[PDB]
PDB file with one MODEL, atoms N, CA, C and O in Angstrom:
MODEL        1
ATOM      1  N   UNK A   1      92.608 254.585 136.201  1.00  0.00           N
ATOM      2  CA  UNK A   1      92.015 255.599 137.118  1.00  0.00           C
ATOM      3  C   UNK A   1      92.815 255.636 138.417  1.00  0.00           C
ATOM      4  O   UNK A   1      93.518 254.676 138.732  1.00  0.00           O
ATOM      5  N   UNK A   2      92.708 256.845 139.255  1.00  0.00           N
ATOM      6  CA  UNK A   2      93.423 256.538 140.721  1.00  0.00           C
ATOM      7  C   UNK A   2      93.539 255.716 141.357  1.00  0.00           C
ATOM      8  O   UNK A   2      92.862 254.746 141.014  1.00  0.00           O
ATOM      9  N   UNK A   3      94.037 255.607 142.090  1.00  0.00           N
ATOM     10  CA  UNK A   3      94.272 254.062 143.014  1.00  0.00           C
ATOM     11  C   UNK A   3      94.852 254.626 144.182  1.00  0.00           C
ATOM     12  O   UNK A   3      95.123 255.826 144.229  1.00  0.00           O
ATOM     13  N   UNK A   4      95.185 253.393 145.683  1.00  0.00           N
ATOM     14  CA  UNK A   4      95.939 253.328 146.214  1.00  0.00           C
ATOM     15  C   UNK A   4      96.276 252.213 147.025  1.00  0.00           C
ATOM     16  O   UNK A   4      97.259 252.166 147.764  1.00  0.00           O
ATOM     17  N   UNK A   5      95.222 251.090 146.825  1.00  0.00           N
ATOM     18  CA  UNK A   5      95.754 249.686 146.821  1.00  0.00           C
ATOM     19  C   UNK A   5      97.119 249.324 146.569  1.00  0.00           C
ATOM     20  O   UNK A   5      97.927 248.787 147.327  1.00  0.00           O
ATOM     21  N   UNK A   6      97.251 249.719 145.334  1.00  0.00           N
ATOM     22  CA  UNK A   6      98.935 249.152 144.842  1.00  0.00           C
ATOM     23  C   UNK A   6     100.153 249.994 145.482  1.00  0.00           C
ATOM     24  O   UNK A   6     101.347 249.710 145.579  1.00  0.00           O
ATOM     25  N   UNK A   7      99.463 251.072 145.861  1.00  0.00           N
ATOM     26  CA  UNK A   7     100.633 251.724 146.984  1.00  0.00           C
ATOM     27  C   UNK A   7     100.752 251.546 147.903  1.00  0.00           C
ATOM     28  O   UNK A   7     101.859 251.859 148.339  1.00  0.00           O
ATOM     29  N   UNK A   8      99.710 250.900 148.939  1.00  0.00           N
ATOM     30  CA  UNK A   8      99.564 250.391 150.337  1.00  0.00           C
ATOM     31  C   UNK A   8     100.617 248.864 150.075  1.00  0.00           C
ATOM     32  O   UNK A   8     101.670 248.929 150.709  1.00  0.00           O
ATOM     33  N   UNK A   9     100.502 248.043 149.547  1.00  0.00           N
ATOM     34  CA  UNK A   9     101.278 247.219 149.314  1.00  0.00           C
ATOM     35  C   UNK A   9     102.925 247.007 148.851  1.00  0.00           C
ATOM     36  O   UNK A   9     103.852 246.252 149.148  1.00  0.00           O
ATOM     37  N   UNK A  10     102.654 248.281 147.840  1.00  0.00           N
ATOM     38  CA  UNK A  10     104.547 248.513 147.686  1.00  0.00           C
ATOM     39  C   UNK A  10     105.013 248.851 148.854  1.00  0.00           C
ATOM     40  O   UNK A  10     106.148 248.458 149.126  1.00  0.00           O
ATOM     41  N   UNK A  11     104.186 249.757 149.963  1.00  0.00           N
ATOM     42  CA  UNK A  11     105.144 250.451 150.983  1.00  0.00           C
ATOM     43  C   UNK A  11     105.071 249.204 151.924  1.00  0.00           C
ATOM     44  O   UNK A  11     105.721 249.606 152.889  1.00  0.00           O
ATOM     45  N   UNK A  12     104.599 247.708 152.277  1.00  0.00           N
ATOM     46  CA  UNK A  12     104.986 246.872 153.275  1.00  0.00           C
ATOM     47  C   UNK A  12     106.342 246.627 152.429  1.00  0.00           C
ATOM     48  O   UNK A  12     107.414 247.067 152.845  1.00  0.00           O
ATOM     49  N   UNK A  13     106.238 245.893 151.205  1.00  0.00           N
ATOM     50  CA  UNK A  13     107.365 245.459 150.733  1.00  0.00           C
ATOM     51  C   UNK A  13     108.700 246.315 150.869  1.00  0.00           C
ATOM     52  O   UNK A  13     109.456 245.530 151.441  1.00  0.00           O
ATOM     53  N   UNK A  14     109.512 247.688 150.620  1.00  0.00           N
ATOM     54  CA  UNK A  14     110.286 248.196 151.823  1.00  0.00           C
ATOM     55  C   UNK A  14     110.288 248.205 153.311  1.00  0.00           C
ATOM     56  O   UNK A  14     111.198 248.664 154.000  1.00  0.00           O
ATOM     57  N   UNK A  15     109.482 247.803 153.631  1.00  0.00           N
ATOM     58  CA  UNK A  15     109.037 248.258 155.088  1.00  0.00           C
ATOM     59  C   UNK A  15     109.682 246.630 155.717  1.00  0.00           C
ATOM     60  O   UNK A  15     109.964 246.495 156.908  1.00  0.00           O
ATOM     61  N   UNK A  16     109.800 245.774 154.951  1.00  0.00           N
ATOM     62  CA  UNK A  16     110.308 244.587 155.287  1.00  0.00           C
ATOM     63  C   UNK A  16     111.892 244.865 155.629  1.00  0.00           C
ATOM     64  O   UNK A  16     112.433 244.554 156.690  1.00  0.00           O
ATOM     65  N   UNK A  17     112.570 245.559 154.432  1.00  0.00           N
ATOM     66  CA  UNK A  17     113.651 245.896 154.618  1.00  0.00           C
ATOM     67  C   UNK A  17     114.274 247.120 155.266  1.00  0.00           C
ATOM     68  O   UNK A  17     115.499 247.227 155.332  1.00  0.00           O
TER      69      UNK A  17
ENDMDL
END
């Protein structure tokens, strides 16, 4: 079903770099 947990989290992980 939708989400956006797992997208809030991918975008720190670039956000590091």
């Amino acid at each position: 079903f939708f989400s956006l947990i797992p997208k809030l989290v991918g975008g720190l992980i670039k956000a590091f770099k």
